[PDB]
């Protein structure tokens, strides 16, 4: 599990929640 409200690990720029997270 991983902190979606933290830049994606992918390092696109935005967040779990708005990114892969999502
Ligand atoms: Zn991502």
Do not use: F, I, L, T
């Not at 830049?7 to 708005?18: A, H, I, R, V």
């Amino acid at each position: 599990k991983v902190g979606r409200n933290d830049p994606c690990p992918c390092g696109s720029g935005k967040k779990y929640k708005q990114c892969h997270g999502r």
